Write a protein that binds this ligand. Structure first.
Ligand SMILES: [Cu+2]
Ligand SMILES: [Cu+2]
Ligand SMILES: [Cu+2]
Ligand SMILES: [Cu+2]
Ligand SMILES: [Cu+2]
Length: 324
C-alpha cells in the first residue's frame, strides 16, 4: 500500500487543492483542439469506444482508464502531486456540493452546449482517428458493432448520449440526493454484500469472450456503480459519462472498493484474480485505446497490465468498507 500519490476522500480538507487542480485541467482540456487526444471530448470517446459494461473486465478497464486520465490531469493542471479524490457515496449519498462549482459542473458554459456544436467540433477528428486504426483496433470496433465512425454517431444521437446545457445532470445543487433504491445501492450493507464474494468473477461480474459482450453482473457493478450513474442522469446515464467530471470521483471510489476487496482476499489467502484457464483469457484481452499524458497511444494494451495499481503508484485514504 506504499505509493507516491494519494487518492483522498473529496470531503478531506487536504483534497481541496486537488479539486482546484482538477478544475484547472478540465478548463485546459476544454480549450485543447480536438486533434489532441487529451481534449475533454476525445477523452470521453475512449469510454464510448472501448469501455466494458456487464462483464469481468469492468473493474480492470476502469482502473486503466482512470489511472491514465489521472496522469493527464496531473500533467495539464501543472500539479505534480495530483491524484483523483474519491466520492464515498456510502458516506455522502448525494452529488457532492463541491461538484456544482465552476467546471466540475458539466452545465458550465465552458462545456459544449449542443449536439450540433459537439458534432461540428468532433466529427473531423473522430474520422481521422477511425482512419488511423490498426487491424487489431478495427476488430475491436467490429466486436462492438461499429463498421464506421458514423455507427458511433448513430449510437450517440439515438441513445441519446449527449445532453444540452441545463440537462447535463438530472440531480441539482438544490436537490442532489439519491432516490430510495440508489440510497440502498450505496448503503454500508450493500457495500459489505459487494465485498463478501471470495472469487474475482462473483465480485467483478461474469466471464464473456470479449469485453464488448454483456454477461451476468456482480453487486459492485449492478447496484452502487450502475444505480449512481443512472440517478445522476444526463451524461452519467450513458456512454459519454466521462463528459461529467464527477465520473472520475465515482470511479476513484469504485477502484478504492476493488483495492479493499483485493486486500481482504490477500488477508484470507484467497485468489485476487481469475484462476486456471480463466487467468490468460482475462489478462490477454486487448485494451487498444488508452492515451498517455503526452497525448500518445500507451504501450500497455492488455487487461493483465492493469490487474494491480502497479506503475500508477497510488494508495487510498481509507473509506467505507468491511466491518472490522
Ligand atoms: Cu506521499
Ligand atoms: Cu464506464
Ligand atoms: Cu510534464
Ligand atoms: Cu508539461
Ligand atoms: Cu462508471
Amino acid at each position: 500500500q506504499s505509493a507516491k500519490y494519494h487518492r483522498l476522500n473529496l470531503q478531506n480538507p487536504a483534497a481541496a487543492p486537488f479539486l482546484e487542480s482538477y478544475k484547472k485541467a478540465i478548463t485546459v482540456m476544454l480549450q485543447l483542439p480536438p486533434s489532441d487526444a487529451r481534449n475533454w471530448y476525445r477523452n470521453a470517446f475512449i469510454h464510448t469506444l472501448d469501455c466494458p459494461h456487464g462483464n469481468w473486465w469492468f473493474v480492470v478497464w476502469h482502473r486503466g482508464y482512470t489511472g491514465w486520465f489521472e496522469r493527464t490531469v496531473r500533467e495539464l493542471s501543472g500539479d505534480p502531486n495530483f491524484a483523483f479524490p474519491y466520492w464515498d457515496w456510502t458516506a455522502l449519498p448525494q452529488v457532492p456540493d463541491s461538484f456544482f462549482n465552476g467546471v466540475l459542473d458539466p452545465n458550465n458554459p465552458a462545456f459544449i452546449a449542443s449536439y450540433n456544436e459537439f458534432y461540428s467540433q468532433l466529427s473531423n477528428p473522430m474520422s481521422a482517428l477511425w482512419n488511423s486504426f490498426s487491424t487489431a483496433q478495427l476488430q475491436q470496433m467490429r466486436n462492438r458493432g461499429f463498421q464506421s465512425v458514423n455507427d458511433v454517431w448513430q449510437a450517440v444521437r439515438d441513445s441519446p448520449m449527449f445532453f444540452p446545457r441545463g440537462r447535463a445532470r438530472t440531480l441539482t445543487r438544490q436537490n442532489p440526493g439519491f432516490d430510495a433504491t440508489t440510497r440502498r445501492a450505496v448503503s454500508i450493507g450493500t457495500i459489505r454484500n459487494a465485498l463478501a464474494p471470495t472469487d474475482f468473477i462473483t465480485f467483478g461480474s461474469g466471464k464473456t469472450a470479449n469485453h464488448s459482450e454483456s454477461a451476468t453482473q456482480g453487486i459492485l457493478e449492478s447496484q452502487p456503480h450502475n444505480n449512481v450513474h443512472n440517478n445522476i442522469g444526463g451524461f452519467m446515464q450513458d456512454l459519454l459519462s466521462p463528459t461529467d467530471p464527477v465520473f472520475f470521483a465515482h470511479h476513484s471510489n469504485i477502484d478504492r472498493l476493488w483495492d479493499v476487496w483485493t486486500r481482504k482476499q490477500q488477508r484470507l489467502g484467497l485468489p485476487t484474480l481469475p484462476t486456471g484457464a480463466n487467468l490468460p483469457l482475462w489478462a490477454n484481452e486487448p485494451f487498444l485505446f488508452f492515451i498517455g499524458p503526452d497525448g500518445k497511444p500507451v504501450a500497455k494494451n492488455k487487461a493483465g497490465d492493469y490487474a494491480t495499481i502497479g506503475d500508477f503508484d497510488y494508495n487510498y485514504e481509507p473509506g467505507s468498507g468491511e466491518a472490522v
